[PDB]
Enzyme design. Structure first.
Site, PDB file in Angstrom:
ATOM      1  N   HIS C 201      18.523  -2.370  83.834  1.00  0.00           N
ATOM      2  CA  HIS C 201      17.593  -2.531  83.032  1.00  0.00           C
ATOM      3  C   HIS C 201      18.039  -3.058  81.257  1.00  0.00           C
ATOM      4  O   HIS C 201      17.084  -3.451  81.317  1.00  0.00           O
ATOM      5  CB  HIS C 201      16.326  -1.399  83.013  1.00  0.00           C
ATOM      6  N   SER C 205      17.346  -8.377  86.445  1.00  0.00           N
ATOM      7  CA  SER C 205      17.955  -8.161  88.024  1.00  0.00           C
ATOM      8  C   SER C 205      18.362  -9.293  88.343  1.00  0.00           C
ATOM      9  O   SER C 205      17.676 -10.465  87.504  1.00  0.00           O
ATOM     10  CB  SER C 205      16.622  -7.772  89.511  1.00  0.00           C
ATOM     11  N   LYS C 227       6.274  -3.714  98.972  1.00  0.00           N
ATOM     12  CA  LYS C 227       7.811  -5.005  99.274  1.00  0.00           C
ATOM     13  C   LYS C 227       9.159  -3.959  99.847  1.00  0.00           C
ATOM     14  O   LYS C 227       9.167  -3.561 101.191  1.00  0.00           O
ATOM     15  CB  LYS C 227       8.565  -5.799  98.911  1.00  0.00           C
ATOM     16  N   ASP C 228       9.159  -2.919  99.079  1.00  0.00           N
ATOM     17  CA  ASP C 228       9.839  -1.456  99.230  1.00  0.00           C
ATOM     18  C   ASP C 228       9.038  -0.411 100.097  1.00  0.00           C
ATOM     19  O   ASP C 228       9.979  -0.334 100.664  1.00  0.00           O
ATOM     20  CB  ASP C 228      10.507  -0.758  97.750  1.00  0.00           C
ATOM     21  N   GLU C 271      35.152   9.496 110.358  1.00  0.00           N
ATOM     22  CA  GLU C 271      34.007   8.559 110.954  1.00  0.00           C
ATOM     23  C   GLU C 271      33.802   6.910 110.574  1.00  0.00           C
ATOM     24  O   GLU C 271      34.149   6.674 109.795  1.00  0.00           O
ATOM     25  CB  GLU C 271      32.660   9.401 110.147  1.00  0.00           C
TER      26      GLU C 271
HETATM   27  C1  HEM Z   1      22.512  17.519  98.012  1.00  0.00           C
HETATM   28  C2  HEM Z   1      22.650  17.749  98.703  1.00  0.00           C
HETATM   29  C3  HEM Z   1      22.855  17.781  99.922  1.00  0.00           C
HETATM   30  C4  HEM Z   1      23.076  19.230 100.969  1.00  0.00           C
HETATM   31  C5  HEM Z   1      22.540  20.598 100.485  1.00  0.00           C
HETATM   32  C6  HEM Z   1      24.148  18.688 101.963  1.00  0.00           C
HETATM   33  C7  HEM Z   1      24.515  20.495 102.913  1.00  0.00           C
HETATM   34  C8  HEM Z   1      25.309  19.910 103.930  1.00  0.00           C
HETATM   35  C9  HEM Z   1      25.093  21.208 105.301  1.00  0.00           C
HETATM   36  C10 HEM Z   1      24.785  22.846 104.944  1.00  0.00           C
HETATM   37  C11 HEM Z   1      25.876  20.182 105.758  1.00  0.00           C
HETATM   38  C12 HEM Z   1      26.018  20.726 106.982  1.00  0.00           C
HETATM   39  C13 HEM Z   1      24.745  21.400 107.968  1.00  0.00           C
HETATM   40  C14 HEM Z   1      25.344  20.218 109.349  1.00  0.00           C
HETATM   41  O1  HEM Z   1      26.653  20.306 110.060  1.00  0.00           O
HETATM   42  O2  HEM Z   1      25.177  18.965 109.436  1.00  0.00           O
HETATM   43  C15 HEM Z   1      26.034  19.206 105.955  1.00  0.00           C
HETATM   44  C16 HEM Z   1      26.195  18.231 106.399  1.00  0.00           C
HETATM   45  C17 HEM Z   1      26.458  16.820 106.188  1.00  0.00           C
HETATM   46  N1  HEM Z   1      26.826  16.172 105.134  1.00  0.00           N
HETATM   47 FE1  HEM Z   1      25.540  16.736 103.366  1.00  0.00          FE
HETATM   48  N2  HEM Z   1      24.578  17.716 102.179  1.00  0.00           N
HETATM   49  C18 HEM Z   1      23.150  17.188 101.415  1.00  0.00           C
HETATM   50  C19 HEM Z   1      23.313  15.551 101.055  1.00  0.00           C
HETATM   51  C20 HEM Z   1      24.822  14.721 101.321  1.00  0.00           C
HETATM   52  C21 HEM Z   1      24.734  13.045 101.106  1.00  0.00           C
HETATM   53  C22 HEM Z   1      24.161  12.625 100.104  1.00  0.00           C
HETATM   54  C23 HEM Z   1      25.568  12.495 102.136  1.00  0.00           C
HETATM   55  C24 HEM Z   1      26.079  11.086 102.362  1.00  0.00           C
HETATM   56  C25 HEM Z   1      26.927  10.878 102.008  1.00  0.00           C
HETATM   57  C26 HEM Z   1      25.736  14.064 103.443  1.00  0.00           C
HETATM   58  C27 HEM Z   1      26.642  14.235 104.490  1.00  0.00           C
HETATM   59  C28 HEM Z   1      26.963  15.079 105.484  1.00  0.00           C
HETATM   60  C29 HEM Z   1      27.566  14.321 106.895  1.00  0.00           C
HETATM   61  C30 HEM Z   1      27.977  13.665 107.022  1.00  0.00           C
HETATM   62  C31 HEM Z   1      27.635  15.732 107.509  1.00  0.00           C
HETATM   63  C32 HEM Z   1      27.789  16.130 108.674  1.00  0.00           C
HETATM   64  C33 HEM Z   1      27.018  16.188 109.831  1.00  0.00           C
HETATM   65  C34 HEM Z   1      27.735  16.120 111.316  1.00  0.00           C
HETATM   66  O3  HEM Z   1      27.286  17.991 111.238  1.00  0.00           O
HETATM   67  O4  HEM Z   1      27.524  15.941 111.581  1.00  0.00           O
HETATM   68  N3  HEM Z   1      25.330  15.298 102.852  1.00  0.00           N
HETATM   69  N4  HEM Z   1      25.658  18.298 104.252  1.00  0.00           N
HETATM   70  C1  HEM Z   2      24.396   5.134  95.339  1.00  0.00           C
HETATM   71  C2  HEM Z   2      24.308   4.094  95.676  1.00  0.00           C
HETATM   72  C3  HEM Z   2      23.653   3.177  95.044  1.00  0.00           C
HETATM   73  C4  HEM Z   2      22.035   2.875  95.103  1.00  0.00           C
HETATM   74  C5  HEM Z   2      21.247   4.302  94.769  1.00  0.00           C
HETATM   75  C6  HEM Z   2      21.750   1.709  94.050  1.00  0.00           C
HETATM   76  C7  HEM Z   2      20.658   2.194  93.318  1.00  0.00           C
HETATM   77  C8  HEM Z   2      20.376   0.703  93.165  1.00  0.00           C
HETATM   78  C9  HEM Z   2      19.018  -0.350  92.573  1.00  0.00           C
HETATM   79  C10 HEM Z   2      17.775   0.677  92.704  1.00  0.00           C
HETATM   80  C11 HEM Z   2      18.888  -1.162  91.824  1.00  0.00           C
HETATM   81  C12 HEM Z   2      18.162  -2.001  91.701  1.00  0.00           C
HETATM   82  C13 HEM Z   2      17.475  -3.132  92.981  1.00  0.00           C
HETATM   83  C14 HEM Z   2      18.009  -4.162  93.732  1.00  0.00           C
HETATM   84  O1  HEM Z   2      17.846  -4.847  93.331  1.00  0.00           O
HETATM   85  O2  HEM Z   2      18.936  -3.318  95.119  1.00  0.00           O
HETATM   86  C15 HEM Z   2      20.134  -1.464  92.242  1.00  0.00           C
HETATM   87  C16 HEM Z   2      20.658  -3.238  91.823  1.00  0.00           C
HETATM   88  C17 HEM Z   2      22.301  -3.631  92.328  1.00  0.00           C
HETATM   89  N1  HEM Z   2      23.374  -2.302  92.097  1.00  0.00           N
HETATM   90 FE1  HEM Z   2      23.364  -0.418  93.180  1.00  0.00          FE
HETATM   91  N2  HEM Z   2      22.637   1.138  93.597  1.00  0.00           N
HETATM   92  C18 HEM Z   2      23.685   1.930  94.935  1.00  0.00           C
HETATM   93  C19 HEM Z   2      24.428   1.480  94.937  1.00  0.00           C
HETATM   94  C20 HEM Z   2      26.100   0.647  93.487  1.00  0.00           C
HETATM   95  C21 HEM Z   2      27.534  -0.185  94.001  1.00  0.00           C
HETATM   96  C22 HEM Z   2      28.150   0.614  95.051  1.00  0.00           C
HETATM   97  C23 HEM Z   2      27.302  -1.344  94.262  1.00  0.00           C
HETATM   98  C24 HEM Z   2      28.743  -2.009  93.624  1.00  0.00           C
HETATM   99  C25 HEM Z   2      28.808  -2.430  94.212  1.00  0.00           C
HETATM  100  C26 HEM Z   2      25.954  -1.052  93.694  1.00  0.00           C
HETATM  101  C27 HEM Z   2      25.753  -2.732  92.848  1.00  0.00           C
HETATM  102  C28 HEM Z   2      24.360  -3.219  91.857  1.00  0.00           C
HETATM  103  C29 HEM Z   2      24.086  -4.649  91.623  1.00  0.00           C
HETATM  104  C30 HEM Z   2      25.362  -5.320  90.852  1.00  0.00           C
HETATM  105  C31 HEM Z   2      22.992  -4.380  91.223  1.00  0.00           C
HETATM  106  C32 HEM Z   2      22.086  -5.927  90.393  1.00  0.00           C
HETATM  107  C33 HEM Z   2      21.685  -6.555  91.825  1.00  0.00           C
HETATM  108  C34 HEM Z   2      21.278  -8.083  91.397  1.00  0.00           C
HETATM  109  O3  HEM Z   2      20.159  -8.129  89.895  1.00  0.00           O
HETATM  110  O4  HEM Z   2      21.370  -9.105  92.255  1.00  0.00           O
HETATM  111  N3  HEM Z   2      25.361  -0.631  93.891  1.00  0.00           N
HETATM  112  N4  HEM Z   2      21.322  -0.932  92.724  1.00  0.00           N
END
Ligand code: HEM
Ligand code: HEM
Ligand SMILES: CCCCCCCCCCCCCCCCCC(=O)OC[C@H](COP(=O)([O-])OCC(O)COP(=O)([O-])OC[C@@H](COC(=O)CCCCCCCCCCCCCCCCC)OC(=O)CCCCCCCCCCCCCCCCC)OC(=O)CCCCCCCCCCCCCCCCC
Ligand SMILES: CCCCCCCCCCCCCCCCCC(=O)OC[C@H](COP(=O)(O)OCCN)OC(=O)CCCCCCCCCCCCCCCCC
Ligand SMILES: CCCCCCCCCCCCCCCCCC(=O)OC[C@H](COP(=O)(O)OCCN)OC(=O)CCCCCCCCCCCCCCCCC
Ligand code: HEM
Lengths: 53, 292, 380, 445, 60, 49, 109
Positions: C201, C205, C227-228, C271
């Site tokens: 910001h 963009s 749109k979002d 995975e």
């Molecule tokens: C702070 C927020 C989050 C909490 C408290 C949380 C908590 C948990 C817990 C308790 C499990 C085990 C239950 C299960 O087997 O599904 C789990 C599994 C998992 N979580 Fe999260 N999680 C969080 C955010 C995320 C996020 C952001 C991701 C992605 C990057 C993620 C990816 C996963 C995956 C891939 C598994 C394995 C699922 C499976 O059993 O196949 N989690 N999470």
């Molecule tokens: C954790 C996951 C991410 C979130 C939640 C996130 C969130 C956002 C949001 C809300 C925007 C503004 C809306 C849009 O333009 O799509 C944005 C734009 C952008 N993000 Fe991310 N982002 C993530 C991951 C990344 C990663 C991994 C990269 C680097 C490769 C990245 C680079 C950018 C760039 C360069 C823009 C500008 C878009 C443009 O003006 O063309 N973001 N992101």
């Protein structure tokens, strides 16, 4: 790396800032062997040899 | 322009020239407010192509030989045309501008037409300027030999400063009185200075005062050419005006050739001439041109 | 009176970032994806919170707690499979977001790009530890393989691996600390996303033409709001048809067995979104070489803004670099396919050629192609 | 026609000493005019806070009548020959100088012998000049740089005679008597602290004969044998700030302690000042100025003006910078200024040192132009160094300066030093003394 | 003869990098000296009560 | 008048080696700076430990 | 130009909140307390995170995990008792912060 910073003035700046950079590297090395307690360094300083580290 | 107009006598001199001339000397040295934001590059190109030509330039060097200066002159200064544009002869109108701006000090300038550069009478006008006071000679002095200061100071118990203003240009002249006074006593200061010049114009002067004025003029010239900058300014002005270099001894000789009857004639020409007035300050008591 | 939207100090930030924000009028549907990522983050957090009220991070009871969630908690199977397929949807939207950033020259926003690659590293670590969390057969052996190859660093690697494990192997302490770290990192991801939005910001963009869109900008509300919302609805359609109809097409069946340290699986995979990096990790017959290959395969996105040698920001008017970009997407898909395959002929030579081609296209071929494209327009 | 032999071609200043001990020095040129002055080693540093306006009030009274030329006669035959009469007082020196023609050289000298020796101090003239000085200090109150430099002296030299102004406070102006002025004259107008300097069309033997005829048999003896001495003045790292928000612009001076007159390091410090330089809003250079401070002040629209000063007194001085700017830029200006100082302490290269050497050479050679600044330099040189330093010696001392000793001298006088800060105007955004003191060193070095 | 903090400022405390080096070296030597002193004080307060004071009767 | 102002006496607060106005500074500034920076350095050593 | 502390968009927030923030000169030690609360909050979070590395939320093993933290984890007793006494310290600082706000009329914000 780039042709912008090539010349006699930048070489003079590097010669000016190289003992400060070396002293900061010495500071970082002493801090690293102090925080990590590196035995291969600290078993040659005479006073801290009794620490067994 | 703001930095230059920060002090009032610059604006007084600008308004005085605008009063005195119809054209070709009344153009301001500083740019007018409407012309800012409007001067273009082709106007500058036109001005340079019409006025920066070879017959109107002098290259003057201090600390260089003639050979180097003449070879850069033939290598640079040969591509220009000739005499360029002529001019407009700077005809005279007269009049008055009063700028009420409520200052604590009233600045007034009353001027008349005088001789041009190269006239002998202009030299007499210069002597007349040093007869009346062209500046102090002592830091915090009373200006004892200044006739205007002696004539005004006897009737003023509050601060003032009066001098004689002289301006000679290549086709025209402007000799007059500059006064700075209080708002409530501008009229008596202006009238006392004008009466002093009128008394000079009636043959009431001393030959010792004329000799002192000549000594002041000679010392001022020799102190003006003392530095290298003033010397080169003098050489360039002489080369542009006359096309030759006049020695300072010859300058002092033609200063000493001035008679006192010429000073009386110059004062009479100022008195009988049509006046031009530029005033600024609190002008509730500043007199008009017909009220003098 | 007083306009409350532009004066109230909490509503002023919301206004400046979502309502009266000047956005380019011509941004395509790809610009939806980042907002989808934010929604996915919230969805994951919400589902994760409702997994945390019944999950126990004990090696005796973790599999039992997961089965208790699926079988006895009311709609607990729904929340668990929403969490798993939402992690998969998160990585789909993340890959398309990164591909949009690579294609349209959005990496010239350097601070936004670097905060992005930090977010990408954090999301990968979170997903890895989350996949370890159910304590299946596949979770234990994936954690064991990943930490064993992390032990390749000289003189500190064994100490660092035993420090991460909290013991001689993957045990109860590893699972409990992985539960704590997997809980805590998505909030750091949310804070880093706030920094990501701030760094975007400062400058607005990018648009698909890559030009200065200052002459044509529209308010974010209601255009990109609706749109979002439409993109959120479509992403929810794909997520619920992934959850309610094919809940195990992306997971591995061997994760439904309990973790046996004595029994090793015949073929070990992470995975799918890790798989291409795994292929790069096994394209070099050296442990340190594979580890540094994985690290630079993720960090080459951070190296990308210094490789831009073209006078045009976007690839809309650059066909040769478009061809090279789609070849890059092609062999990224190839590396994803190799990463799920066992290590025999011809998968070894295909993966080696794919890794070599990946690094040569990103490092060498695109700047040379940009120089050639500048030469064709009489610019170079 | 090189620079070295051109500086050798400058005429030598010829110095002689009379029987009473006053120096007579002259430099001859081919000009038809001349400048003859008397320099007295007396100023506000020699006053003891009961006669703080004494030298100022005497230089007001010096041209208003003597014993042999009462009243306005001295005006009449100083300006019947077209001569110009000037006088000034600093904190350490007093000067009475006349610009005249060469042929009026004898009378001018005895006019000077009529001024510093036989002044008549009339009481109604004392009342008139008391009122004149009071309203002239009222005039000087509205010039902000004079106020700021007086504040800088007052906060840098606290408890010492160097803090007080040349004019003194207004109460002393109201109660100075004739007896205190005569005591000041009989204490400080002594022959071994007087230099009769002349420059231009002056013959040195004629000047020596006229000084023997007119300036002899004066003073040389303290009447109670109470010989005064010049005590050292303590520098105090401090800050004064006079906040007054109705003023349109703000003036800020930041200085450190200088080394004094006799230290050669001044030359090196002058080169350092030439690296930082000066800027005013009417400068035509714009963004392409060689000074980084002036370039960033143009580019960010920071300051109305800035300048660097090296004011030297007897083994002390103020070395620093004065800038005028609007309020909203003040802190930012300070930041950039301090950065330049630390650059000169750490990363001074040879190109900017060569540029500063050329600037200093041009500055001193351009300053020594005309009879008045040459006579002024002769008077200060014999009052301070005891001799007139030739210009070739100045060129040798400039050319011996390189980047290494410039870094050493700038680190010795600038790095991690407590400055004196004076501020006047809208100075709310002027940073704290702690922030300025932290900005006087670098954590990266 | 200059005062000891004057010599310390002229040698070590003037440059920030040398300041940090002095801080680090003093950190090592201060850690070792304070560990010795505090262990000696605690053991002198608790003579005859700790395991290291009585373990020689059971090492056999 | 701006010359009427005077900095008041700070001798209740000043150090003993800067108390005299007739003697110079710079032969005691290094001692004062060394004392203050020694306090800062010992504080930094304790915080680092 | 190089005033990064007031031009960098991240660094200007820390600058505007903690470096160039205009604060009253005369605030007493009571105004320290809220800052202490933030630091104490951080302490709680940090200790809690390490307490989350060995605690199981199962009724058959929660007490057992607490005893295992206090006995077998290296300095686990230190982390647990810093967490508990930091909760007590947090509430002490809350009570003094609220009392400052009540006494000095700070509730008009
Ligand atoms: C702070 C927020 C989050 C909490 C408290 C949380 C908590 C948990 C817990 C308790 C499990 C085990 C239950 C299960 O087997 O599904 C789990 C599994 C998992 N979580 Fe999260 N999680 C969080 C955010 C995320 C996020 C952001 C991701 C992605 C990057 C993620 C990816 C996963 C995956 C891939 C598994 C394995 C699922 C499976 O059993 O196949 N989690 N999470
Ligand atoms: C954790 C996951 C991410 C979130 C939640 C996130 C969130 C956002 C949001 C809300 C925007 C503004 C809306 C849009 O333009 O799509 C944005 C734009 C952008 N993000 Fe991310 N982002 C993530 C991951 C990344 C990663 C991994 C990269 C680097 C490769 C990245 C680079 C950018 C760039 C360069 C823009 C500008 C878009 C443009 O003006 O063309 N973001 N992101
Ligand atoms: C083909 C037959 C129909 C036809 O000709 O349609 C023309 C029409 C294009 O007409 P156009 O005038 O050339 O373009 C202007 C658009 O209509 C202007 O609309 P738009 O396409 O810009 O709309 C924004 C965009 C918004 O799209 C998103 O937000 C998508 C978000 C990303 C996908 C979901 C995330 C997960 C991805 C996992 C992989 O929506 C779409 O692209 C289509 C939305 C369809 C909603 C359901 C309709 C039933 O085609 C479509 O819209 C294609 C989709 C519908 C068929
Ligand atoms: C699938 C279909 C893609 C497609 O249609 O591509 C063509 C489209 C053309 O769009 P454009 O070139 O901007 O021009 C608009 C028309 N004149 O171009 C686009 O739509 C551009 C799409 C950019 C993002 C593509 C992301 C693909 C997946 C990449 C995953 C790996 C990313 C890198 C990881 C390391
Ligand atoms: C506490 C012990 C007493 C401290 C003390 O001496 O307080 C006196 C002090 C005086 O301060 P003041 O009136 O500003 O005078 C300054 C002039 N020298 O006055 C103060 O310091 C007043 C501020 C004290 C704030 C803390 C005391 C109350 C703590 C409990 C508050 C509970 C609030 C409600 C919580 C549940 C809901
Ligand atoms: C997000 C950060 C936090 C985490 C992860 C966390 C985690 C824990 C855990 C695992 C325990 C049980 C271990 C034990 O009994 O000592 C605990 C106890 C406790 N926590 Fe926290 N905590 C956090 C923040 C806080 C905060 C902010 C407070 C309030 C100041 C707090 C107050 C307590 C209290 C009072 C106990 C009971 C202590 C006891 O009786 O042993 N915690 N916390």
């Amino acid at each position: 790396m780039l042709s912008r910073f090539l010349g006699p003035r930048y070489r003079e700046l590097a010669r000016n800032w190289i003992p400060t950079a070396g002293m900061w590297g010495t500071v970082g090395a002493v801090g690293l062997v102090w925080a990590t307690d590196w035995r291969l360094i600290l078993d040659w300083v005479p006073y801290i040899n009794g620490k067994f580290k | 322009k703001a930095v230059a107009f920060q002090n009032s006598q610059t604006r007084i001199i600008e308004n005085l020239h605008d009063v005195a001339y119809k054209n070709a000397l009344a153009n301001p040295l500083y740019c007018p407010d409407y012309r800012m934001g409007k001067i273009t590059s082709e106007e500058l190109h036109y001005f340079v192509q019409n006025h920066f030509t070879s017959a109107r330039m002098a290259l003057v060097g201090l600390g260089v030989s003639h050979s180097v200066l003449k070879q850069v002159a033939e290598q640079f200064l040969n591509m220009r045309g000739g005499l360029g544009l002529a001019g407009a002869k700077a005809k005279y109108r007269g009049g008055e501008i009063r700028e009420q701006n409520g200052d604590n000090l009233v600045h007034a300038a009353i001027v008349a037409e005088s001789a041009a550069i190269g006239n002998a009478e202009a030299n007499a006008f210069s002597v007349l300027q040093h007869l009346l006071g062209a500046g102090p000679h002592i830091k915090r002095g009373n200006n004892t030999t200044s006739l205007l200061s002696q004539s005004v100071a006897k009737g003023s118990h509050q601060p003032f400063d009066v001098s004689a203003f002289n301006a000679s240009y290549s086709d025209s002249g402007l000799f007059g009185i500059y006064t700075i006074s209080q708002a409530a006593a501008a009229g008596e200061v202006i009238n006392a200075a004008y009466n002093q010049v009128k008394a000079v114009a009636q043959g009431n002067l001393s030959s010792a005062d004329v000799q002192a004025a000549k000594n002041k003029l000679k010392a001022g010239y020799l102190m003006s050419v003392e530095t290298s900058e003033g010397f080169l300014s003098e050489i360039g002005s002489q080369a542009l005006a006359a096309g030759s270099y006049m020695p300072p001894s010859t300058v002092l000789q033609q200063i000493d050739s001035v008679a006192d009857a010429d000073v009386v004639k110059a004062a009479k020409k100022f008195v009988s001439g049509k006046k031009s007035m530029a005033a600024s300050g609190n002008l509730g008591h500043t007199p008009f041109l017909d009220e003098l | 009176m007083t306009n409350m939207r532009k004066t109230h100090p909490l509503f002023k930030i919301i206004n400046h970032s979502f309502i009266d924000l000047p956005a380019p009028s011509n941004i395509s549907s790809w610009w939806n994806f980042g907002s989808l990522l934010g929604v996915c983050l919230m969805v994951q957090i919400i589902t994760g919170l409702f997994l945390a009220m019944h999950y126990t991070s004990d090696t005796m009871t973790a599999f039992s707690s997961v089965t208790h969630i699926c079988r006895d908690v009311n709609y607990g199977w729904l929340i668990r499979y929403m969490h798993a397929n939402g992690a998969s949807m998160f990585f789909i939207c993340l890959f398309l977001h990164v591909g949009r950033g690579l294609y349209y020259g959005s990496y010239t926003f350097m601070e936004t790009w670097n905060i992005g690659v930090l977010l990408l590293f954090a999301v990968m670590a979170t997903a890895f530890m989350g996949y370890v969390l159910p304590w299946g057969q596949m979770s234990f052996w994936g954690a064991t393989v990943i930490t064993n190859l992390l032990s390749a660093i000289p003189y500190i690697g064994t100490t660092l691996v035993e420090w991460i494990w909290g013991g001689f192997s993957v045990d109860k302490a590893t699972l409990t600390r992985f539960f704590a770290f997997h809980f805590i990192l998505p909030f750091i991801i949310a804070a880093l996303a706030i920094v990501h939005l701030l760094f975007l910001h400062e400058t607005g963009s990018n648009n698909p033409t890559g030009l200065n869109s200052d002459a044509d900008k529209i308010p974010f509300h209601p255009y990109y709001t609706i749109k979002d919302i439409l993109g959120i609805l479509i992403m929810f359609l794909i997520l619920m048809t992934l959850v309610l109809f094919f809940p195990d097409m992306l997971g591995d069946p061997d994760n439904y067995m309990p973790a046996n340290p004595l029994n090793t699986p015949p073929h070990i995979k992470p995975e799918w979104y890790f798989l291409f990096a795994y292929a790069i990790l096994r394209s070099i017959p050296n442990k340190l070489g594979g580890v540094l290959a994985l690290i630079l395969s993720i960090l080459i996105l951070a190296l990308m803004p210094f490789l831009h040698t073209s006078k045009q920001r976007s690839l809309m008017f650059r066909p040769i670099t478009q061809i090279l970009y789609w070849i890059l997407v092609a062999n990224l898909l190839i590396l994803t396919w190799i990463g799920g395959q066992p290590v025999e002929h011809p998968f070894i030579i295909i993966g080696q050629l794919a890794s070599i081609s990946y690094f040569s296209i990103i490092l060498i071929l695109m700047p040379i192609s940009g120089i050639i494209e500048d030469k064709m327009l009489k610019l170079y | 026609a090189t620079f070295a032999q051109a500086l050798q071609s400058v005429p030598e200043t010829q110095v002689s000493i009379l029987d009473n001990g006053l120096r007579v020095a002259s430099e001859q040129s081919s000009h038809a005019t001349c400048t003859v002055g008397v320099w007295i080693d007396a100023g506000s540093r020699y006053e003891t806070e009961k006669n703080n306006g004494a030298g100022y009030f005497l230089e007001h009274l010096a041209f208003k009548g003597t014993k042999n030329r009462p009243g306005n006669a001295l005006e009449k035959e100083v300006e019947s020959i077209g001569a110009h009469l000037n006088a000034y007082s600093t904190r350490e020196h007093t000067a009475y100088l006349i610009k005249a023609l060469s042929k009026d050289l004898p009378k001018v000298v005895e006019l000077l012998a009529d001024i510093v020796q036989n002044s008549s101090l009339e009481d109604s003239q004392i009342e008139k000049e008391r009122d004149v000085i009071l309203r002239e200090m009222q005039e000087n109150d509205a010039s902000m740089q004079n106020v700021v430099f007086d504040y800088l002296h007052a906060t840098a030299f606290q408890g010492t005679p160097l803090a007080q102004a040349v004019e003194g406070p207004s109460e002393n102006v109201r109660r100075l008597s004739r007896t205190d002025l005569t005591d000041y004259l009989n204490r400080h107008y002594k022959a071994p602290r007087m230099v009769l300097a002349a420059a231009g069309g002056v013959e040195h033997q004629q000047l020596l004969d006229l000084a023997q005829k007119h300036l002899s048999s004066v003073s040389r003896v303290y009447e109670e044998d109470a010989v005064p001495g010049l005590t050292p003045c303590r520098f105090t790292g401090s800050e004064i700030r006079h906040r007054d928000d109705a003023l349109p612009l703000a003036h800020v001076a930041i200085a450190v302690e200088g080394p004094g007159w006799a230290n050669p390091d001044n030359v090196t410090l002058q080169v350092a000042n030439a690296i930082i330089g000066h800027y005013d809003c009417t400068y035509g250079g714009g963004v392409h100025l060689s000074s980084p401070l002036a370039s960033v002040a143009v580019a960010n629209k920071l300051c109305q003006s800035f300048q660097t000063f090296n004011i030297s007194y007897s083994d002390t001085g103020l070395l620093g910078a004065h800038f005028v700017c609007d309020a909203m830029s003040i802190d930012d200006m300070v930041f950039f200024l301090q950065g330049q100082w630390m650059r000169l302490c750490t990363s001074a290269t040879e190109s900017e040192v060569t540029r500063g050497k050329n600037i200093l050479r041009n500055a001193l050679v351009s300053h020594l132009d005309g009879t008045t600044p040459v006579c002024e330099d002769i008077g200060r040189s014999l009052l301070t160094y005891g001799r007139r330093i030739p210009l070739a010696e100045w060129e040798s001392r400039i050319q011996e300066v390189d980047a290494q000793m410039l870094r050493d001298i700038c680190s010795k006088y600038f790095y991690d030093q407590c400055p004196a800060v004076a501020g006047y105007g809208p100075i709310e955004q002027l940073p704290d003394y702690n922030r300025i003191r932290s900005g006087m060193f670098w954590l990266r070095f | 003869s200059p005062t000891i903090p004057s010599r310390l400022y002229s040698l070590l405390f003037r440059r920030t990098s040398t300041f940090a080096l002095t801080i680090a070296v003093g950190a090592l030597f201060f850690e070792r000296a304070f560990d010795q002193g505090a262990d000696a004080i605690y053991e002198h307060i608790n003579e005859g009560k700790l395991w290291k004071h009585i373990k020689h009767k059971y090492e056999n | 008048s701006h010359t009427d102002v005077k900095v008041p006496d700070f001798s209740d607060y000043r150090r003993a080696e800067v108390l005299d106005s007739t003697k110079s500074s710079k032969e005691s500034s290094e001692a004062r700076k060394g004392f203050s920076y020694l306090v800062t350095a010992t504080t930094t050593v304790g915080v680092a430990y």
